[PDB]
Amino acid sequence: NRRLELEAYRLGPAS
Amino acid sequence: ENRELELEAYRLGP
Amino acid sequence: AGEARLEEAVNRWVLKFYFHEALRAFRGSRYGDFRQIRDIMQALLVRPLGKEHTVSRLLRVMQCLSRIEEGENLDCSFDMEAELTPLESAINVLEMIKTEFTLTEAVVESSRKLVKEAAVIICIKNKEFEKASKILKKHMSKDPTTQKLRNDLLNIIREKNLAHPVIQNFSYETFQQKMLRFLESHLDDAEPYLLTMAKKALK
Amino acid sequence: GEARLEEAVNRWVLKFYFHEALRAFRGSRYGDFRQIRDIMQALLVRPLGKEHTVSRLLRVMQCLSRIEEGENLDCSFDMEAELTPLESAINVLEMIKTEFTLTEAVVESSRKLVKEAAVIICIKNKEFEKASKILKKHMSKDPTTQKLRNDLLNIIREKNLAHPVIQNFSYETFQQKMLRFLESHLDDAEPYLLTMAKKALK
Numbered sequence A: 001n002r003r004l005e006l007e008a009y010r011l012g013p014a015s
Numbered sequence B: 001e002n003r004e005l006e007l008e009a010y011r012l013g014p
Numbered sequence C: 001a002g003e004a005r006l007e008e009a010v011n012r013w014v015l016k017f018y019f020h021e022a023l024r025a026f027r028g029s030r031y032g033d034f035r036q037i038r039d040i041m042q043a044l045l046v047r048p049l050g051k052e053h054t055v056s057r058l059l060r061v062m063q064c065l066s067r068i069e070e071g072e073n074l075d076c077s078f079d080m081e082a083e084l085t086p087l088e089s090a091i092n093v094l095e096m097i098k099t100e101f102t103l104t105e106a107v108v109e110s111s112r113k114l115v116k117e118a119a120v121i122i123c124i125k126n127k128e129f130e131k132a133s134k135i136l137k138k139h140m141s142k143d144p145t146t147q148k149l150r151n152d153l154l155n156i157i158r159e160k161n162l163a164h165p166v167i168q169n170f171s172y173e174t175f176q177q178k179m180l181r182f183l184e185s186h187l188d189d190a191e192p193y194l195l196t197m198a199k200k201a202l203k
Numbered sequence D: 001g002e003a004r005l006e007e008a009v010n011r012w013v014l015k016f017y018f019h020e021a022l023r024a025f026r027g028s029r030y031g032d033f034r035q036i037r038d039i040m041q042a043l044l045v046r047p048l049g050k051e052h053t054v055s056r057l058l059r060v061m062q063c064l065s066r067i068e069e070g071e072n073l074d075c076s077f078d079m080e081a082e083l084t085p086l087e088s089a090i091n092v093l094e095m096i097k098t099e100f101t102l103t104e105a106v107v108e109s110s111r112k113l114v115k116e117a118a119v120i121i122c123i124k125n126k127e128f129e130k131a132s133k134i135l136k137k138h139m140s141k142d143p144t145t146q147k148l149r150n151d152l153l154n155i156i157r158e159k160n161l162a163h164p165v166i167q168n169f170s171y172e173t174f175q176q177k178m179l180r181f182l183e184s185h186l187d188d189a190e191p192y193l194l195t196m197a198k199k200a201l202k
Helices: A003-007 C004-027 C031-044 C053-069 C086-100 C105-125 C129-140 C144-158 C172-184 C193-202 D004-026 D030-043 D052-068 D085-099 D104-124 D128-138 D146-158 D171-183 D192-201
Strands: none
Touching: A003 C086, C004 C031, C004 C053, C004 C172, C004 C193, C004 D004, C004 D192, C031 C053, C031 D030, C053 C086, C053 C172, C086 C105, C105 C129, C105 C144, C105 C172, C129 C144, C193 D004, D004 D030, D004 D052, D004 D171, D004 D192, D030 D052, D052 D085, D052 D171, D085 D104, D104 D128, D104 D146, D104 D171, D128 D146
């Protein structure tokens, strides 16, 4: 879904 | 695709 | 009040400035510089910025470019579960951009086609055919403008034909820069206040 | 000109967030301080030109960072140690003494506090060997510190965490004294970005 890292406005990658 | 200019030893965080 | 509203104002200037430098770095294929500036903006977004549509729009574009920049690394993930490749993630961001920028489907379709094509081709180039098929199925089976291309790609995958012109003529550098001009064309192309003030001060 | 425009803005931004970091710290808003610190850290990787003022700035920023995390002994600021954050603060303090060209007598008073605090925190975390080692290497003065140093030696051996010296210690009071010490050797003037924001919002 991603939904929650998107809302967080995450620019850089998880890993 | 550099593009620093310093080095650490000015480390603020851990 | 006029102590926090001062912090929010400056934080907005600082963010908008580094956004401009990030685009300049990307434009010149200086991706090391882009990634460094991205990390600065990342630490900045957690600060109070008020509620402007402009910083929100800014961050979405910034998110898209970040995923496109890491797009050739299928081992890289932007979600904590590593379900999606960066270009699959970029597709999701593009839709948010279409929404927040109030774009017409006709305006977005050509560039969205580019991202979808790149996502599949990178998988093919890495001989990740199962992944290619999945992405193809999920992003081109139900899209009117992609059918002609979708057909070429199924055949390429099934024949495992990396020597096909569609694969051989693909340039990831060319792809990145095409996406950037699209995103820049829907941006307030005015110079950031901090740069302008620096130009006066050094004059 | 080119590239010198980036360095100019980078300096304004660093100096501004330095100003905000001190303000956050002064108001005991350490969450805001830590966030601002992370921004300044991410900036260090960019070109800043070379000003003596930002070097002094970063040292103070370094001292406050180690002091802010001083209670977290699982935190490390150096990559060869084995040093607790307050031990790192002591090392930074010496850089500050040199770079600010301060006299030993001026620095002496505030360094005792850090030495005092570093030992007491190890005691509070029941890290007595570390407490002893730090005590033996730093607090080993002799004059006005004799009464307290002896108290700490006795506490460590008996593991008496209920001793008033340990119980009455206030880290919040310690932090704010250190900040005020550091601010006493700092200019003084408002950061350019703040001034521009004032003239902009009136």
